[PDB]
Amino acid sequence: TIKEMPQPKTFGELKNLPLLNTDKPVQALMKIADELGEIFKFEAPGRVTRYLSSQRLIKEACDESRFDKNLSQALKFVRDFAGDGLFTSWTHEKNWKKAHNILLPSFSQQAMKGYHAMMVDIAVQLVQKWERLNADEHIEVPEDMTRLTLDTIGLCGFNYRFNSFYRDQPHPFITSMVRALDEAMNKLQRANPDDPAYDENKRQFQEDIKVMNDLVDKIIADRKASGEQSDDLLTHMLNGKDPETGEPLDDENIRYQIITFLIAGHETTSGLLSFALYFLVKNPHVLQKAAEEAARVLVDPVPSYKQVKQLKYVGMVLNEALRLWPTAPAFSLYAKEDTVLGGEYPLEKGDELMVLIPQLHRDKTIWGDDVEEFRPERFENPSAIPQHAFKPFGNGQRACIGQQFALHEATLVLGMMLKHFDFEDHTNYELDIKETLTLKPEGFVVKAKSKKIPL
Ligand code: HEM
Ligand SMILES: CC(C)c1ccc2c(c1)CC[C@H]1[C@](C)(C(=O)N[C@@H](Cc3c[nH]c4ccccc34)C(=O)O)CCC[C@]21C
């Protein structure tokens, strides 16, 4: 039976647009989904989209014969500096399939054996930082996790050291990247963007793009000028040929790929580690089980690749953090042809869908009544999970190319943190989720008491 779609409250001629005039739009859309259910229409002047929250409908949205990746307005604003890199390109652009074919082997689970030593380099810098704190001191969790994830992708990506553990103020490239990302996100709720009042924003945005291009173009030119073969993605991109076209990536597209990886490794991955540690300190029995696994498995001064693979419970902790607060919380699709969603909702070719991942991950028909509880054991038997119920890394050929990298890095770092320190929630931290490009537990702080185990 063809059904009328619910719609949240309207503001006359502005329709639903003012609902996203908020500093926590994902959390606002989750509350709307709680009220309206598995699908709702969102209208603004000149656009309509449909927000999906149920596994029943998202399993159909994930059918690549019926739906392809759409560039949200968010991605279109980020494309002004990420260009036709993998994340901000349409599936039909030549540079998407070329870069996908060239880079897939560099991002495989087996490729992680080659990045492992570099990931350990940065993970040891984090452990040494925390070992060197004085008794009276605390840890700023998202800040240190971001130092770690940014430095890991810089070193594994391009053999470039941001040296984030040597700094209070970000590296100048990172101040320009963060300010460009903040401008991109700010433009989503900026009425009259061509008001001369925004001339200062536009000048600054162009300066920040120039800072990013200048450093990345220099690193690519320097690498071509040296002939050096390294264990990094830049070597793979300079040498690689697409088997289909037989072509390599050009230097401009390589720059966009590097900027794309640095955005990804600065945002989503540090939020995963921040939320994982938040949930562990709030659930001491889970923390104890994870710490027991780390002590049993990590028997050497630094972890081996194989030891990280044997941190099964730590991997379940990470999946359970991704379930509750996935740090890339939505993605957009368009209908390839006219189609009916869920036997109830007719769509025309081109019609857009948004997948609200945190709400999908709270579908009680999948996870049961205890959906708000942090219970990593939910992931003990993943064959029991119905199709498309768990989507923190997106869908199909447009799924996260970085998934294996992100999870290897996070499992290694969290394993070492649990081996080396006991943790205290010394402030009884009240979760406050700040929304930018990503989600983070803003102001999350802990104390770490060394177990005095040498590296
Ligand atoms: C916990 C960490 C991460 C999460 C939750 C995450 C999540 C996602 C999601 C949901 C998408 C699909 C976006 C869409 O459909 O519009 C995506 C795409 C992508 N991610 Fe990640 N990501 C993570 C880490 C990384 C890392 C570390 C890298 C690279 C080093 C990376 C690179 C990418 C790229 C290049 C794409 C585009 C892939 C394509 O369309 O060909 N991500 N990610
Ligand atoms: C770049 C990646 C990492 C990213 C980051 C944040 C968001 C996305 C993706 C995609 C989804 C997006 C939200 C939830 C979203 O639905 N937006 C939609 C709808 C929309 C909101 N205001 C607009 C102004 C003009 C045109 C469209 C829009 C959209 O962006 O089209 C808005 C906040 C940022 C967020 C989480």
d(CA 429, CA 221): 46
Phi, psi of 355 (to 5 degrees): -95, 115
Tell me the C-alpha distance between 191 and 228, whole Å: 49
Task: For residue 236, give Cα distances in angstroms to 181, 223, 231, 249.
Answer: 27, 12, 8, 10
State the amino acid at position 118 in one-letter form.
M
Specify the resolution in Å.
Answer: 1.4
Query: What domains appear along the chain, each with residue ranges and CATH number?
Result: 1-455 (1.10.630.10)
How far from the centroid of its chain's Cα atoms is residue 121's Cα? 22
Do 71 and 332 touch, CB atoms closer than 8 A?
Answer: yes
Instruction: Give Cα 48 to chain centroid, integer Å.
Output: 26
Task: Provide CB contacts within 8 A for 398, sequence distance 6+.
Answer: 68, 69, 91, 331
- Tell me which method was used to determine the 3D structure: X-ray
Gapped junctions in the chain, after residues (C–N > 2.5 Å): none
Please give the DSSP secondary-structure letter assigned to residue 208.
H
Query: Which atom of ligand 1 has the smallest separation from the CA of 157?
Result: 30
Exposed/middle/buried for 361, CB within 10 Å: 0-12, 13-18, 19+? Answer: buried
**Which two three-digit tokens encode residue 92?**
């039909």
**248, 94 contact by CB (below 8 A):** no
Q: Is the CB of 347 under 6 A from ligand 1?
A: no
Q: Rounded CA gap, 285 and 3, in Å?
A: 46
Which of 295, 296, 276 minimizes the C-alpha distance to 286? 276
Q: What is the 3-state secondary structure (H, E, C) of 275-332?
A: HHHHHHHHCHHHHHHHHHHHHHHCCCCCCCHHHHHCCHHHHHHHHHHHHHCCCCCEEE
219 CB neighbour count, 10 Å cutoff: 19
What is the 72 CA–ligand 2 centroid distance (Å)?
6
Q: Burial of 368 by CB count in 10 Å (0-12 exposed, 13-18 middle, 19+ buried)?
A: exposed
388 alpha carbon – ligand 2 mean position (Å): 22
How many angstroms separate the CA atoms of 306 and 284, rounded? 27
Residues with CB under 6 A from ligand 2: 20, 25-26, 29, 47, 72-75, 78, 188, 328-330, 354, 437
Q: Give the contacts of 278 (CB within 8 A, at least 6 positions apart).
A: 141, 429, 431, 441, 444
**Which of 72, 183, 267, 331 is the best mutation target for the ligand 2 pocket, counting ligand atoms within 8 Å of the beta carbon and taking the most?**
72
C-alpha 64 – ligand 2 centre gap (Å): 21
- Helical spans, DSSP H, in 132-170: 141-158
Ligand nearest to the Cα of 90, by number: 1
Closest residue CA from atom 28 of ligand 1:
402
Neighbours of 312 (CB within 10 A): 13
Flag whether 400 is marked binding: yes
Residue 322: C-alpha distances to residues 51, 329, 418 (Å): 20, 10, 19
Give CA separation, 303 vs 112, 130, 205, 454, in Å: 13, 18, 41, 13
Q: How far apart are CA 282 and CA 131, in angstroms?
A: 22
Residues counted in the chain: 455
The residue type of 363 is D
The encoded tokens of residue 299 equal 């028997």
Q: Give residue 15's identity as a one-letter amino acid code.
A: K
Residues 6+ apart with CB under 8 A from 48: 41, 42, 351, 352
- Tell how far the Cα of 61 is from the centroid of ligand 1, in angstroms: 18
Torsion sign (Cα): 148, 153, 158, 162: negative
Report whether 131 contacts 450 (CB < 8 A): yes
As annotated, the active-site residues are: 268, 393, 400
What's the rounded Cα separation, in Å, for the pair 159 and 219? 9
Strand order in the sheet with 421-424: 139-140, 445-450, 421-424
Does 345 count as an annotated binding residue? Answer: no
Kindly report the number of other CB atoms within 10 A of residue 72's CB atom. Answer: 17
Q: Residue 302, Cβ neighbours under 10 Å: how many?
A: 16
Which residues have C-beta within 8 Å of that of residue 395, sequence separation ≥ 6?
61, 62, 64, 331, 333, 355, 388
Is residue 66 within 8 A of residue 339, CB to CB? The reply is: yes
> Strands 67-69, 421-424: parallel, antiparallel or unpaired by DSSP?
unpaired
DSSP letters of 7-75?
-----GGGTTGGGG-SS-HHHHHHHHHHHH-SEEEEEETTEEEEEE--HHHHHHHT-TTTEEE---HHH
Q: Which two tokens stand for residue 19?
A: 């609902």
